[PDB]
Scaffold this active site. Structure first.
Site: not given
Ligand SMILES: C[C@H](O)C1CCN(c2nccnc2Oc2ccc(Nc3nc4ccccc4s3)cc2)CC1
Ligand SMILES: [Zn+2]
Ligand SMILES: [Zn+2]
Ligand SMILES: C[C@H](O)C1CCN(c2nccnc2Oc2ccc(Nc3nc4ccccc4s3)cc2)CC1
Ligand SMILES: C[C@H](O)C1CCN(c2nccnc2Oc2ccc(Nc3nc4ccccc4s3)cc2)CC1
Ligand SMILES: [Zn+2]
Ligand SMILES: [Zn+2]
Ligand SMILES: [Zn+2]
Ligand SMILES: [Zn+2]
Lengths: 318, 318, 318
Positions: C74, C223
């Site tokens: 971030h 995002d």
């Molecule tokens: C909090 C922010 O708004 C965003 C939230 C989503 N984000 C992601 N973008 C691409 C890939 N991954 C992102 O965040 C995740 C979103 C979902 C997961 N899901 C899981 N990851 C795991 C790993 C191990 C065991 C269980 C789980 S469930 C992991 C990471 C970027 C940050």
């Molecule tokens: Zn963001």
């Molecule tokens: Zn944010």
């Protein structure tokens, strides 16, 4: 007046922090900009709202912060953590200490590792660092105190300016002794003397030399307090400690000297047994003796014992 | 006068540093705030106490430091390390170089990687960086020299202000050629020419073009000097080098280009063989040719050979 | 005049960047000091050279940069990356948006994560952070907008100073809604409403409430855009994301709370399956709905599908 406005004001923290800050195993959290407020809160509760001028205290704290280095363990977070452990000891032994001592010890804890590079006294001696030429014994600790005095000498930084010269000299001596006591090399002889005096009943807190020794053990207890936190905190902190030790071990190898296994990253697998030996030889006897002298510090010993059990669980592979 | 007070003064280091700084395999240590003093000491011993005005030199050094970036290898520590290797060459070949050359070469070494991002000339070309559009060949090296001139142009930073314009132009040309020579792409042709001139006996240090070539090889020798340190230092430095290379490899992958195995972190297991090939093709011939031309630089070659043996030991799994 | 000189000037980038910046899967590169210029270029092309006063815009950008923290994901790079994705959406749907919206959305994207600590809203609530006491819902997002307004209030920082008060209030509302929409907790209800309105044909971009919803989905799409990059970029970015999540998981453990497997570093082996579930439940439906509403955003969905296939390949061990 300025002191009248400060008397009417009261500094406060969030609900969870207000409650849990009283516990010995409290963790200060990952929000750096909250630590100064946490320290001020502790000073206000343990000493009083009229102990320091708020503007001067805040100026002092930020300068102390600026003089801690970005190292894995001996950093600004460690300083505030050590200060918190002292706060918990002070609050649970409130009738024992003077106003000067409560003022001095919290400040001593905040300043006790000022300008730490993440290297031991042994390494500075072997490297032939200028500090080792100036301070033959307790090299880093004498430097920490020198840094403290230098910060106090800055314009608008003398937090003890309202004290008489007599009281000023007394608090600076309290601070000096406390910081020097954090040299772990001095702990072993100190604890041994304290154990003997306690068992014979000669130990007397009304005797200044005895009192200095107890304060010295309190400083050791606060300094090593990572072993008195809950297991997740204790285990994660251990990562920071070894990061520093292994870096020193690398530097030892660069001098053409084989480092002790403690500082050798090639011997990572011996860490659980290495921790076991540390708890048995150093940590447990420290908190045992402190609990004997100051029984309200019992939670530190219990938590230390719990972490000792956890390390034994790691060794067995459970 | 100011120069009279400087003549009476003598800059000194700790006992161990004073003795061991004369060795080719000396390591400057982890104490950053000691490096400026180490450089000044080297300048004072190799050139003289009257070569630079101390206040101007210190101002220059701190500005150079400020213009090195926080990268794993091409950093402030590398700059001072390269400067030390040059110092050792200068001191062991003391009758050969003029006052201007000794002044220029130490400064050239300190400034030779100014404002390095940790990326190669190849990457900047492929990314289409503005620097690649300005400098078609030796992209980073031409930038390093441009940064050097810019620092010298700052108020109170002209360390060569007491020189005549003629001498000023001469020292800046020495510096320019030396920094450009650190482009390893130019080393291969330079060493090949030097080997031929040495074998035929046409090599003549009284010939400026020949002299420029030898200085060029000296710069390569100083630049690659991590391979001439003792094994613990050499092995740990390799970690810093690959950190940068793998980061570039990651960036290459982001451009949709498969990086060479050297820069590919997925091929970590091929590092020992990769190092073996580097020593055989680049490092050994460099120090062999340098030892032929300047026999007192022999310790660099011996240490390079010792490290080659160590990498062979890694390959065998011993 | 000043606006007349700006009208004659044209801001330009290197050849490769000029061409590839138009692609949805463009990566901004590792050269930090090029990002401000990249943003200005995007503003000039999407809005016009007369939209902002250049001196004020540059002053604003550098202050925004200064207010992003050194965290793994971030950070400042994320802000410019999100802004680029918005630029690509704007340029491929150019007839749809007003001048105010194009101005507001690029700025909203640049400012949308201002002063992010690398912790979720959930963690701040559990820690009992002062921000959670001030903002009950969308804690960090309300803070991001507060930071935006504070930067705009600084002397010489009001980039919207040439706007009427009416237009100023409109653009600030656009920015507020856009930043709040980046709270992923709000995305699920938003997408569900948008899907229903699209299928029934009630969805109308001339309706402000509907328009706000579409902008909200656009913000989610920008995002999460790391999943719409090419595989090498997507995979490497995932390392940065989990670095932050695991750090939060560590902090959760320090509070005495078992973190969800997503934030637990002890469950690294479940990452490929965890990503698979994220693409199926969140990423794919987001870009599917966006492609339905804005068909030129199709490349985002295609790339997201390609990355979903790559994660499936990891699970199989291929
Ligand atoms: C909090 C922010 O708004 C965003 C939230 C989503 N984000 C992601 N973008 C691409 C890939 N991954 C992102 O965040 C995740 C979103 C979902 C997961 N899901 C899981 N990851 C795991 C790993 C191990 C065991 C269980 C789980 S469930 C992991 C990471 C970027 C940050
Ligand atoms: Zn963001
Ligand atoms: Zn944010
Ligand atoms: C130097 C400072 O005053 C403190 C010294 C003690 N300290 C520690 N606190 C909690 C846990 N560990 C601390 O430091 C250590 C103290 C002792 C050891 N012991 C050993 N660790 C190992 C590891 C591998 C092989 C052999 C050994 S022996 C390791 C670390 C914090 C820093
Ligand atoms: C770019 C700069 O001028 C210098 C270039 C040379 N340099 C090195 N010094 C000592 C050791 N290694 C240095 O860089 C390397 C030079 C050559 C290699 N060779 C290879 N390494 C590998 C690793 C894996 C697979 C294949 C290969 S090939 C790796 C690193 C320091 C930086
Ligand atoms: Zn200490
Ligand atoms: Zn300490
Ligand atoms: Zn270079
Ligand atoms: Zn170099």
């Amino acid at each position: 007046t300025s002191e009248e406005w400060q008397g009417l004001m009261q500094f406060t923290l969030p609900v969870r922090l207000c409650k849990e800050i009283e516990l010995f195993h409290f963790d200060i959290g990952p929000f750096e900009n909250m630590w100064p407020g946490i320290f001020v809160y502790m000073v206000h509760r343990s000493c009083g709202t009229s102990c320091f001028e708020l503007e001067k205290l805040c100026r002092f704290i930020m300068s102390v912060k600026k003089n801690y280095r970005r190292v894995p363990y001996h950093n600004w977070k460690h300083a505030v953590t050590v200060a918190h452990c002292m706060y918990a000891i002070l609050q649970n032994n409130h009738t024992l200490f003077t106003d000067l001592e409560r003022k001095g010890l919290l400040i001593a804890c905040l300043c006790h590792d000022l300008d730490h590079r993440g290297f031991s006294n042994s390494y500075l001696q072997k490297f032939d660092h200028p500090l080792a030429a100036l301070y033959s014994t307790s090299t880093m600790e004498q430097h920490h105190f020198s840094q403290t005095v230098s910060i106090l000498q800055l314009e608008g930084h003398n937090i003890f300016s309202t004290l008489s010269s007599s009281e000023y000299e007394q608090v600076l001596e309290i601070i000096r002794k406390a910081i020097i006591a954090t040299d772990l090399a001095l702990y072993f002889g100190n604890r041994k003397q304290l154990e003997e005096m306690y068992q014979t009943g000669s130990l007397n807190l009304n005797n200044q030399s005895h009192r200095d020794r107890v304060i010295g053990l309190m400083m050791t207890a606060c300094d090593l307090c990572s072993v008195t936190k809950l297991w997740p905190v204790t285990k994660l902190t251990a990562n920071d400690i070894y990061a520093e030790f292994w870096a020193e071990g690398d530097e030892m190898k660069k001098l053409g000297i084989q480092p002790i296994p403690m500082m050798d990253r090639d011997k990572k697998d011996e860490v659980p047994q290495g921790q076991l030996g540390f708890y048995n030889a150093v940590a447990i006897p420290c908190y045992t003796t402190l609990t004997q002298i100051l029984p309200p510090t019992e939670p530190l010993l219990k938590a230390c014992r719990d972490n000792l059990s956890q390390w034994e669980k790691v060794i067995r592979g459970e």
